Structures are given as structure tokens and as C-alpha cells.
Design a protein around this nucleic acid. Structure first.
Lengths: 37, 136, 128, 126, 134
RNA sequence: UACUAAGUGGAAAAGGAUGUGAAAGUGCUAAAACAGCAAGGAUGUUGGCUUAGAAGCAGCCAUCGUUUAAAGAGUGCGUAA
RNA sequence: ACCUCGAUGUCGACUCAUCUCAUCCUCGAGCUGAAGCAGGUUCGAAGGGUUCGGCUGUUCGCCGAUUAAAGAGAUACGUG
């Protein structure tokens, strides 16, 4: 995956959610996948 | 790095940088200003890096203006030295930013690119910032 | 189905027209022979879905933007659009607009002339 | 807004009372290409094609004193065709359209404002 | 390094010698000397042998071939077909075509071969001249 | 009485965050709003150029008008096109 | 220079090791300009394993042969 200190959607259709107080971003392109923010 | 030409002394006091701003809160020439929520010290290299970064992404018609200028000297004695024995040498130049102080003002170019560029330039500054609109 | 803009002569430069079920040679010969009346003209040739899908071909009624280019007293168009070229009159614009009014599905003469002027104000020529 | 709503209601009511016989079908496989092709097919015939919302058209038909108020509420992509002046060309074009189309269902309207089925309309506009 | 200087004009603007001295060979001996010095200053640009590559393709694997040609500093913006099969002509530099041979061979599964012909010599970019010396 | 749903309480950063409540102003909307779904999404237009062949969507120019409730030289992908 | 001077015994190897995870290996997983082998990077996982020699007194280091790898540290820079 990808680990950063902040997450931002570079692509358009990426959506932001929070599961178990962990913020994640989902896109149809696997390269737009950040997990820690 | 805008090094001063001549100085009366060499190793003065640094600053008492607490309290409100002595000025620079106003916006004069630009359309967007970058204000600070508190005060700290700004060294010379950071100013030059931020200025070249903001100018590289700037267009060909907008104009930017700096409100600060390094006017304080600093002493940093070389490593392994003991505490005492006179004062050291000058190593850099420090500008003082009090609370509620504006550092940059930019104008004459579309606003969205300007807010993006001001964010990307203020990320290079040690103090968290805030965008402020043109004062009439 | 196939969308392309080629010449009205040979069918060689068509790779999708010969990929849906229409053969190249036996039909490019037909295009060269039958359409010899308007040979050497840029017409968008299309095919439509049929039960056999071996021959169902049509072409839209002839639009000629090249006539506007030649009416500008030029042969190679200008990259820019704000430079006057030649001295065109209303006659050429009319002979193009009434020609292409059968291709502009909106049956309006003055609006067709205005549309030709608009597609010509970007070409780099102003109608009188 | 409601201002433009009322203005458009007045406009459609005026254009509806101006003509004698008006019909509106749907034809929901409408591909703008076929839409403008049929628009060309009209040409020289007085009627001007148009497209309006179903709510405002229902309100206009309610204010126009013609039977068949709720019949227009059915699903579809309504093509308003109120014949301008001369109306026989409009009916001829509509029957040519229904012959060309696989099938189009009777939405609303009649020629000489006495609503009936399209079977009589086929006889009149053949 | 001794690269071929071909079709170059020489114009002796000025010269002088010694009436009873200045042996003749020294002239030509000097001819290479000065030409070196200013030649170092001149910073010469190269001239690469540009060739033409004709590739017959069934127009089903042209993507890899076209991408490789683009990577090999060529000019491609379409296709030119012999009415049933596409024989594309591409301008290529000779400096990288040797590996490109087997790259094209493997990209098309060995289905498409080509022929080499000498087109001409064309001007070089700076990305070639920076490799002129170590 | 209101809040937090993280053991914060019971250790703080620069930077992020469709978190939560509070307030200020604003649009739409029972002639039914925001959505999903069903229909469309045209035309001069592979506009003019660049390039042998690049043209709604590799590059520059215009980036406009028409049928229209409505359609952008288009919001993106893809194709050598 | 705040504890120690009417004692706080410092380097190195040897034996015994223990502990932490910013993982050297084994384990699982994503991404990738990853055909496969083979990679590169990141994410959790510390139960276990983590070589032998020539040089200088030795950690530091060089070199040699190899190993799935020949971990990074601390414990009075562990233990007279």
C-alpha cells in the first residue's frame, strides 16, 4: 500500500472514508491508493 | 538571501518577539496576503527558497511583494566549544515575525492559482499561516 | 458502424470500415468506380448495422470546408485565426451555405450563413 | 423560478389557443440526430417542433379547456408539435414519422380539438 | 576523436612566412595545429546517419512497434498501407537500431521483418553530442 | 444542563480529515428539490493548423453559431488516428 | 558539573547471554514502467536463527571463503 502523513485525491473519482478511525481513499486506479493519513 | 550591506554593530540582541505586531498587518499592493497566527524567527535561506519557488510557478503578469527583511544577527559558536568566553561569529540573518504579521502579498493574476501557490509557498515557512483578502 | 473522414476516392485509408464485415478490395474498387463522379472529395463515409453486415454503406450529403479554404485564395490553412486572407465576397459564402444547408439539419438560410461565418471567423477570413 | 414558470405557462397557453388542432406524441428512442432529421422533414410545414416539461404542459392543457388532462403524465420524452397556421402538413409529417418509426404511442391532442384514437388520425392524415 | 569531416571549405584569409626560412612541411604541420585549438573552441555538432525502416505489419501488433520507434527518436503519426497490409516507413538513427532489431523481433513474435536502406546524414540533437567524449 | 463514543480524560507538533454538535447568511423545493434509473447527449466538425497518416479527448489558433428543455472544438479513458 | 574522592576498577577478546524493533533471514500482503525467473518499495509480524578466518591490542575497518542472512542497538558504551 501507501503510507503518508496526509492524504489527498490527485485523481477526480477518488473518495475518502474512515474505517476504525483510519482514513482511506478509494479509486478505480490501484495507483491512487493511500491508507495512512 | 538579501544580505545587509553595512551594519553599525556586529552582535546585537536578537529580539523580544512576543506581543502584538509592530506593523505589517496591513496589505498594500497585493490582492492576497499571507498572515501568521503567531510570531517566530525566519532565517535567510528559507526566504530565498520560498521566493524562488513562488516566482517559478508565478505567471508573466502578476506581481508579489515581501513585507519582511532580515535585520537581526545571530551567534552560533562552533561545535565542542564551552559555555562562555566572549561571543561567537555571525552565521546567518534572522527576520522577526510577530503575531498577526503578513509576509507576502500578490496581485494581478487569477485567484485559484494564487491561493494554490501561496499554500505551496507557505508550506516552506516555519509558522502556520492564513490567507487574507485584499483590503479596500 | 464506423466514423472517419477520408477522401471520396479510394477506400484504402479506412481501417475500421474494413473491420466490421466489409471487405477492402472488392468494395474499394466499387467506391473508386461508382463514386468516380465525386472522386477526390473529403466526405465522411459511414456504415450502419444490418442483418448481413457485408454491405451497408452510406455517406452524408457533401460538406466542403475545402471550398471555403480555396475561396480564401489559399491552399494551406493558417495556424492562427486573426489574420485576414484574401478578399472574399458574399457570393462564395452563399454558394457554400446553400450547398451545405442540406447537411445542416436546421432548415434556415440566414442562420446557415451565420454558422458558415462562425466556422469562417475561426478559419481566419471575414465574409463581406 | 415561478416567474418564468408563469410566463412560460402564459406563452404555451397562448400558442395552444392560437391553433385549432394540436397533437403531442412521445417517441422515446429520440436520438437528437433523428430529432433534427424529423425537424428537417417538417420544413416548409408551418408547425415548429418544441420540447417542454410535462408538469407545465399538463397545467397548460388544464387551462386550455381540452379533455385528456392526466393522459400526458405517462412516461416518455414528449415532442410538442402545434401546427403553425396550415395544419394538414403537420398531420402528414406526423403520420410519416409513425410510418418511419417502429411504433410511437398516442400521448395527447387531436386535430380539431375532439380527442380520439390515432386510427381516425391515420384516416385523416394518410 | 577523428570523426569524419566531409565536404568542408577552407579559405586562407591571412598568412606569412620567412623569406629564406619557413620550410614548406611546417605549413601543413601548422595546419593541423591551429585547426585543433580553435576546433576545441568551436564545439562541433555531430551528423548522424539517418536511415529508413520499412516494416510490413498485419496491423494487429503495431502498437509495440510504434512505441519502440518513438522511443528510438523517430517521427510517426499514423500508418501507410499497401491496400491490404501496412508497410510503415520510419526515420531512424543508426546508433540504437541494433538492439531495436531484436526488440521488434520479440515485440511482434518474429512475425514482422524489415529491410535496411541508407537514407542520408541528418543533424544531431544535444543528447547525442553530450556523448561525443567521456 | 449540552458535549464527546476516541479510554480523549490520563503527554504536546508542522500537516491532513464526506467526524460531531453550535451559530451566522444564502439557493432550490409539494406547479415535487438532491439523487439513482430510463431516454437522449446533434450540427458546420478529422473546425483551421501541427503531423504523409493526430481532428470532441499527443501538441497551437479560434475554444464560435444553429435545431433546440439540451448538447461542451467537449469530463475523462482508449486507439498510430 | 548535581551525585562519588575515610575508592564509583576504564579498553579488548572468552563463557553466559537478556531485552527493544527503525526486520538480516524465514512468514503473510499491497503497489509497481511486475511475461516468468528475478526484482524495487512499502505494510504487520521480535517465537526461532543471525558463519569461519589473515592484518593490527581491539571494537572501527580491509580482504578471503562461504550462508536463507552473515541484523541496528542497549544492559556501569553487560559481566577483573
Amino acid at each position: 500500500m501507501k503510507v503518508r502523513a496526509s492524504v489527498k485525491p490527485i485523481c477526480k473519482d477518488c473518495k475518502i472514508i474512515k474505517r476504525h478511525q483510519i482514513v482511506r481513499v478509494i479509486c478505480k486506479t490501484q495507483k491512487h491508493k493511500q491508507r495512512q493519513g | 538571501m538579501l544580505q545587509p550591506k553595512r551594519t553599525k554593530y556586529r552582535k546585537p540582541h536578537n529580539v523580544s518577539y512576543e506581543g502584538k505586531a509592530k506593523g505589517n498587518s496591513y496589505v498594500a499592493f497585493g490582492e492576497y496576503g499571507l498572515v501568521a497566527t503567531k510570531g517566530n524567527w525566519i532565517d535567510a535561506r528559507a526566504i530565498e527558497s520560498a521566493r524562488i519557488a513562488i516566482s517559478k510557478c508565478l505567471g508573466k503578469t502578476g506581481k508579489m511583494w515581501i513585507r519582511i527583511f532580515p535585520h537581526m544577527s545571530k551567534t552560533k559558536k562552533p561545535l565542542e566549544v564551552r559555555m562562555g568566553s566572549g561571543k561567537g561569529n555571525p552565521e546567518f540573518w534572522v527576520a522577526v515575525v510577530k503575531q498577526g504579521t503578513v509576509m507576502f502579498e500578490v496581485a494581478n493574476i487569477p485567484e485559484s492559482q494564487m491561493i494554490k501557490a501561496l499554500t505551496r509557498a507557505g508550506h516552506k515557512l516555519p509558522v502556520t499561516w492564513k490567507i487574507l483578502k485584499r483590503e479596500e | 458502424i464506423a466514423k472517419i473522414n477520408l477522401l471520396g476516392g479510394q477506400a484504402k485509408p479506412g481501417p475500421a470500415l474494413a473491420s466490421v464485415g466489409i471487405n477492402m478490395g472488392e468494395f474499394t474498387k466499387q467506391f473508386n468506380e461508382k463514386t468516380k463522379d465525386k472522386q477526390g472529395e473529403m466526405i465522411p463515409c459511414v456504415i450502419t448495422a444490418y442483418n448481413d453486415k457485408s454491405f451497408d454503406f452510406i455517406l452524408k450529403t457533401t460538406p466542403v470546408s475545402i471550398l471555403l479554404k480555396q475561396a480564401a485564395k489559399l491552399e494551406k490553412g493558417a495556424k492562427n485565426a486573426k489574420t485576414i486572407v484574401g478578399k472574399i465576397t458574399m457570393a462564395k459564402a452563399k454558394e457554400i451555405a446553400q450547398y451545405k444547408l442540406v447537411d445542416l439539419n436546421a432548415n434556415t438560410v440566414e442562420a446557415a450563413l451565420k454558422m458558415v461565418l462562425g466556422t469562417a471567423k475561426q478559419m481566419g477570413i471575414e465574409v463581406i | 423560478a415561478k416567474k418564468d414558470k408563469a410566463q412560460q405557462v402564459a406563452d404555451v397557453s397562448h400558442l395552444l389557443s392560437t391553433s385549432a388542432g394540436f397533437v403531442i406524441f412521445d417517441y422515446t428512442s429520440m436520438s437528437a440526430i433523428e430529432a433534427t432529421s424529423i425537424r428537417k422533414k417538417l420544413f416548409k410545414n408551418g408547425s415548429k417542433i418544441k420540447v417542454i416539461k410535462n408538469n407545465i404542459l399538463r397545467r397548460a392543457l388544464k387551462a386550455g379547456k381540452f379533455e385528456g388532462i392526466d393522459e400526458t403524465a405517462i412516461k416518455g420524452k414528449l415532442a410538442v408539435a402545434v401546427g403553425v397556421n396550415e395544419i394538414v402538413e403537420t398531420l402528414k409529417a406526423v403520420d410519416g414519422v409513425v410510418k418511419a418509426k417502429e411504433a410511437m404511442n398516442f400521448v395527447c391532442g387531436y386535430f380539431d380539438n375532439r380527442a380520439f384514437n390515432s386510427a381516425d388520425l391515420e384516416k385523416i392524415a394518410k | 576523436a577523428g570523426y569524419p569531416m566531409i565536404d568542408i571549405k577552407a579559405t586562407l584569409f591571412d598568412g606569412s612566412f620567412h623569406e629564406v626560412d619557413s620550410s614548406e612541411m611546417a605549413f601543413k604541420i601548422a595546419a593541423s595545429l591551429a585547426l585543433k585549438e580553435a576546433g576545441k573552441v568551436c564545439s562541433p555538432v555531430l551528423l548522424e546517419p539517418i536511415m529508413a525502416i520499412e516494416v510490413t505489419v498485419p496491423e494487429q501488433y503495431f502498437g509495440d512497434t510504434m512505441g519502440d520507434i518513438s522511443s528510438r527518436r523517430g517521427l510517426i503519426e499514423g500508418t501507410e498501407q499497401r491496400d491490404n497490409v501496412q508497410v510503415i516507413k520510419a526515420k531512424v538513427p543508426l546508433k540504437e537500431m541494433f538492439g531495436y532489431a531484436t526488440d521488434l523481433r520479440s515485440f511482434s513474435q518474429g512475425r514482422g521483418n524489415y529491410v535496411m536502406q541508407f537514407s542520408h546524414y541528418a543533424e544531431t540533437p544535444k543528447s547525442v553530442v553530450n556523448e561525443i567524449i567521456a
